[PDB]
Curated annotation (Swiss-Prot):
This is Tau-tubulin kinase 1. ATP binds at residues 19-27, 42. Belongs to the protein kinase superfamily. CK1 Ser/Thr protein kinase family. One of its GO terms (molecular function) is protein serine/threonine kinase activity. It is found in: Cytoplasm. Disulfide bonds: none annotated. Expressed in the brain, particularly in cortical and hippocampal neurons. Weakly expressed in spinal cord and testis. No expression in adipose tissue, bladder, cervix, colon, esophagus, heart, kidney, liver, lung, ovary, placenta, prostate, skeletal muscle, small intestine, spleen, testis, thymus, thyroid or trachea. GO terms for cellular component: cytoplasm; cytosol; microtubule associated complex; neuronal cell body; nucleoplasm; nucleus; perinuclear region of cytoplasm. Residues 13-276 form the Protein kinase domain. Keywords: ATP-binding, Coiled coil, Cytoplasm, Kinase, Nucleotide-binding, Phosphoprotein, Serine/threonine-protein kinase, Transferase.
Length: 293
């Protein structure tokens, strides 16, 4: 562990426990000694080859003022480590889905989480970055009376800038090694092609099928190449058997997209809103994990 328990950062953030494992950094839960609340503290050693914290902070600062994003508290650098302090969130969508009796969410919960995730995806792309690791464990529900019904986008570690200073689209590399989670990865990412905005939309599509149907055909299969081969040949139309009919629009729209084309986020959002109108789902409705109703 980069920081032991009870260690104090910049004489303000006292380490309570480690909450996220090792890779290219560590996530800790800490106490803010000034404001008295608990915070998320992400740390990377200063003696590290691939240093991503700087990029994560750049993305988090650019996103301040948007919904579905943690509040930026602080950051710093020293001879031992680099750190970022941010607003702490609650239960992640992967643990919430697993806790469900049949491992499925109702369509009401699925469609509304869908709207919130799409808004956070549109928000990250409007600032010129691709998330590239859209998955349920990267989304968490709030932990406050003002936020318990709000879904937050987490972890900008695999993000990449796709639009330069002037808003021009950066050239794609001929080969771009894909390093995210296999399960929700698009066919383009499996092909090691440069990922675009549509690839974050493909992950949201596979997350929503998994949420409503409880499984994806390629679940439990661990070999990256094999999953990519199963996806390429799988009749995605057959993924929609039990999904609302408008998802064929979502699917036809994302299938047509390339690296350069801006997606039609409104058509995708319309697919969820009309799906909800057609079946009387309301915004005030309780989420599946909430009891007493």
């Amino acid at each position: 562990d980069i920081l032991p328990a009870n260690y104090v950062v910049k004489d303000r953030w006292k380490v309570l426990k480690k909450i996220g494992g090792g890779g290219f950094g560590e996530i800790y839960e800490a106490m803010d000694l000034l404001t008295r609340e608990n915070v998320a503290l992400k740390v990377e050693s200063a003696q590290q080859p691939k240093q991503v914290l700087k990029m994560e902070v750049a993305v988090l600062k650019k996103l301040q003022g948007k919904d579905h994003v943690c509040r930026f508290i602080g950051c710093g650098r020293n001879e031992k480590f680099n750190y970022v302090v941010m607003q702490l969130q609650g239960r992640n969508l992967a643990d919430l889905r697993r806790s469900q009796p049949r491992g499925t969410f109702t369509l009401s919960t699925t469609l509304r989480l869908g709207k919130q995730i799409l808004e956070s995806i549109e928000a990250i792309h409007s600032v010129g970055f691709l998330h590239r690791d859209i998955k349920p464990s990267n989304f968490a529900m709030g932990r406050l009376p003002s936020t318990y019904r709000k879904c937050y986008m987490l972890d900008f570690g695999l993000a990449r800038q796709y639009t330069n200073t002037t808003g021009d689209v950066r050239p794609p590399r001929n080969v771009a090694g894909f390093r995210g989670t296999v399960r929700y990865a698009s066919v383009n990412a499996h092909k090691n092609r440069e990922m675009g905005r549509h690839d974050d939309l493909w992950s949201l599509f596979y997350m929503l099928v998994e949420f409503a149907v409880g499984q994806l055909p390629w679940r439990k299969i661990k070999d990256k190449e094999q999953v990519g081969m199963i996806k390429e040949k799988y009749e995605h139309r057959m993924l929609l058997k039990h999904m609302p009919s408008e998802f064929h629009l979502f699917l036809d729209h994302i299938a047509s997209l390339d690296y350069f084309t801006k997606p039609d986020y409104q058509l995708i959002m319309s697919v969820f809103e009309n799906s909800m109108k057609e079946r009387g789902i309301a915004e005030n409705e309780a989420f599946d994990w909430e009891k007493a109703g």
